[PDB]
């Protein structure tokens, strides 16, 4: 009715709140059948989990996304959740991509096991009324709510009566037009051509574009009717027509009013948001839906407002059309009856009127092309895949494929590969274990996560309330950390940094005979690091100092301690792992040129070139070649069997170095020591770095066996779990469990 | 005896631990007499204060320095302590520069009031034995201990018998040679020519170089004798000769063994360090001693070891020489008897042998020059100053002068003008209130301070344990702080930063009609800030964005809120002050060219060019001139009466802006609000920054009266205490008091 499209383009029509719910059947691959298995022990209780749950049957898995500012933010949410679910599921099982089930078993569909008794009776009640089999069909729900600013600006132009009465009018107008033009959305994205056993008799009928949206599929209580003319009409009709209700949850409409506990309870408080169910899982998107699909639908929803007769008659008429479009064969074009020009013009008009992105023009044009040739529609891609009126061959094929994808970069969280690996893992644990979370910053790796009343702010993976206050204070310092350690009678090196070459020599006077290490504070691979086991000559020392300044602003000068460097990760009071790092290298095989040996080592999945990963790819760089020539070999030369050639002088993972889990070989005495050192800083999750000359021999202070070179209060955790060599150990889960003992 | 000078130059002879104790009489200027006043109420109890105390009389003030790595670190310590003492003393009183008293009053010298009863009896006991008058003489004590590394390396060459037996031998050798050649130190730095009343009869005798070191001055118990041949001999002789003891504290020697509770108690545990008392307060150094004096003495002490007969005879012989040198007239040269060539060669030899700094060669050469012409000696400068055999005219003159110095830069701590003003003040409070402290970093403004068992780590003045953990975590962020605030329903601007111009326009879509402010994250004076009260045009907006990138890496875009910006300082739960800042400016006086007006405003002591200070000097820079031309005026033009000319577009103290204390004019409602906002971050010492359009009108959320632009968790505190206009309020003391409720 209202024409606020008339309104100024400065208004943000695109503003909205998105939510995304996905249901899929867990499929047992060997048995080619529904899992018939318990909800995984890795996932977080079905009682509190916000993102992952079970819709009706125990097999049917539902992933619910937190609320999202953009369509984009919701999609990523769906991706991450789907990924956690991918890797949390039993390895034998996989997720069923199609809306239609794989095979039909009344026995297999067993009401999900829920602790709440009332849930059981309602699920039971539901089972009796419609039967177990219908509950198996899966789909995705699209939940949209309009931006307050968008709504408030719209409200100001039309009338001054009520935030709530107005919203309601608007929401109602939308739902109505949604039902009216829904057929289009169903047409573009029909994903349900056939059923293996669900459909009692339509094999003869043949493939239809969308069974799920079809009359025959989950459309009971034909007698039940709700007038959508007004919120009151819908609300009065719904309450009174409580037969379907058995509250009003049992009512099954294409678009459900939401944010309201009971129909009419919130008529007073407004429609919080509308939720759409028209969408059918899509086989080609791992998550089940595509961005383009999401934003198209968005503009489509939007067209309706712009394109604001009799609600009762027209909506009734459309069901005929929608069913017709739904029942129609995939390649078969849309009827002449459909008011296609009205929806297209509208969307076009919206874009033209509001100066929208060419991206939305790109989505409309694709919509038009599908109208031009039907294969383009989701159904058309789909038709070829179906064989013998069964896509079960295909479904298995896609479901397994996608399962491999879920396991494709085990370290990365599909939603968030941009962020630090350490945070990604933590985030993974959060999603599977059911903690609620907000990425407050992302860029800063800042997270807010909470369970119920309890809230924890963590930054960069391991920066938490548990760490004592001095840690954040001294985190940058290093020099300070040494002092409180030194005051605690702990083994330390003797070095002091000097700035601007200010009397560095005076320091040189301080330390001469003693082996010295000179390095810039930044301390990269060591493009600028100067190390003298030999006592530095005064001239030699000056040049080393000056290179440091060339490389960076602050020069660090330290005692040299001969030993092998190891990283201890301490959590609470106990060292949870230990790691050795070595300079990038390859070992000679009679057969292969060094260039080859490298290429071969880079074939490791952990080494990542395109995406950041636990290990870095080895590049036979200039720095490297020289190292090669210096060993007397060459990129081309072929090394001897078992001859280790070293590519980089100093050991770093970033340079392509190796991480080796040493937790079980390391002498326990030093693991102890690393944790006493963390205890002395009250650092809950610190990472200690000892230089140990003999890791087999036990540590004795008398022996000055070990000396703590550094102490990092944002240890990088992923390095310990994913190593070139060694087993590794899980770090991210343990921290989170300790953060939230309840959950 | 031992000749470890023979040892390799790589050994650090210079390594040592220094301490410095200074005693001065508080002098009442108007009364030209000893204060006769109670130890100040500003200072920290005489019961626990480590740095500031009273030696014998209540007037006599003693400043004790923590222990110092360099001579340099000790001097600065002395400076800071002397400065705190300068400004803590009553304004009427001042510190007496000369060792000799100003006037002599048996009545005026009243035993210092100490809570401990035993102290009283010992002070009483002391008063009866030697009388009140002698206790008034003041001097500085020089405490040196040799570096363990220096001692351990020395120990290794000579023998393997004992850390302790060896140290003892060494220490003993030093003290003995000290007594033997002490005369030289007394000669160079004699500062006691005459006494106004102390000296009963030597006016006829005439000016002597050093009365304080003279036999006649505080040299009682002539009968008492201690053999210094051996530690045992000194120890046995001392215990038995307990007559002087009345423990052994009453024994008064030029060099006292220290670090040992009782003579011989620690013979088993070693001489911890030697302490020298030869030095007499020096009139020309505000602190009473000079670096050159300190390092010379250092090499001198060192000569003795290199220059390692009969201890008893020679030490006895020297007292004759020392007294002679002490008694001798200031201009009068050193006797032919003095083995000057031996001490000089020795020091020379030390320098030559150990490859020491030319700086030490510079100190020796000065020593030689004083030998050449005696005026150079401290006494010679001094002789001219004394008039009518009384330097009391001079002492008043110097003491007052120095008092003005103590008050010279009230904001700066003389020891530490290098460090952030906020930290300097805090440090001041620490020193006067008697808290113990270590500057752990200095560069990072990192402090460890403690009282007894209790320890607090503070960084940058106001970073403490009291601040909740999220603050250090979110301190950098700003964007994060907004969120937890926004979640707490607090008034906020609508801005979001975009990085690398990534869809900034999309944001521009988000905000168009709304007044916008665009600025780089760095946010300097605004060399790169672009502000549009006017809605930004798309083209205009792009250029503003791009300038931000030219100026800095991250671009910030925010809502514009019209109002005047104010800084609230919140402590615990209560806003303790409020400040307005305005762009640098000058007001027209018919008479003066703008260049003049500036020069005149820069005459303010708070504006600092040479040293950093609460206010910055105004420079008629290019940026400024243009602002001038733009107002249509010019550096040269003469402005109208009361016409405010604005030098800088945006208001900053750094650019030369004005700080104005607004604490008492500000509407209380907003002071409240700023503290609720700090409470919501659990920020103990945060600094809130509101934009308030009407500071006289009360704040109403309905009115959206105020909006919190920023929130700083390292507020800069000095700005509030020292303002161009307004009274200001003390911030540094209150924080420290709350940190340590006991002290």
PDB file of C-alpha atoms in Angstrom, chain A residues 129-130 221-225 237-248 250-251:
ATOM      1  CA  UNK A 129      -0.018 -36.173  13.574  1.00  0.00           C
ATOM      2  CA  UNK A 130       2.236 -36.162  10.485  1.00  0.00           C
ATOM      3  CA  UNK A 221      -4.132 -29.397   7.595  1.00  0.00           C
ATOM      4  CA  UNK A 222      -5.443 -28.238   4.245  1.00  0.00           C
ATOM      5  CA  UNK A 223      -8.559 -27.384   6.217  1.00  0.00           C
ATOM      6  CA  UNK A 224      -6.530 -25.029   8.417  1.00  0.00           C
ATOM      7  CA  UNK A 225      -6.550 -21.480   7.088  1.00  0.00           C
ATOM      8  CA  UNK A 237      -7.304 -16.787  12.961  1.00  0.00           C
ATOM      9  CA  UNK A 238      -4.177 -18.497  14.307  1.00  0.00           C
ATOM     10  CA  UNK A 239      -5.096 -18.581  18.003  1.00  0.00           C
ATOM     11  CA  UNK A 240      -8.634 -19.788  17.433  1.00  0.00           C
ATOM     12  CA  UNK A 241      -7.480 -22.276  14.817  1.00  0.00           C
ATOM     13  CA  UNK A 242      -5.561 -24.048  17.535  1.00  0.00           C
ATOM     14  CA  UNK A 243      -6.375 -27.513  16.090  1.00  0.00           C
ATOM     15  CA  UNK A 244      -3.154 -27.401  14.052  1.00  0.00           C
ATOM     16  CA  UNK A 245      -1.469 -26.051  17.163  1.00  0.00           C
ATOM     17  CA  UNK A 246      -2.025 -29.115  19.294  1.00  0.00           C
ATOM     18  CA  UNK A 247       1.144 -23.304  20.722  1.00  0.00           C
ATOM     19  CA  UNK A 248       1.171 -21.909  17.234  1.00  0.00           C
ATOM     20  CA  UNK A 250       2.963 -26.430  14.570  1.00  0.00           C
ATOM     21  CA  UNK A 251       1.651 -23.913  12.039  1.00  0.00           C
TER      22      UNK A 251
END
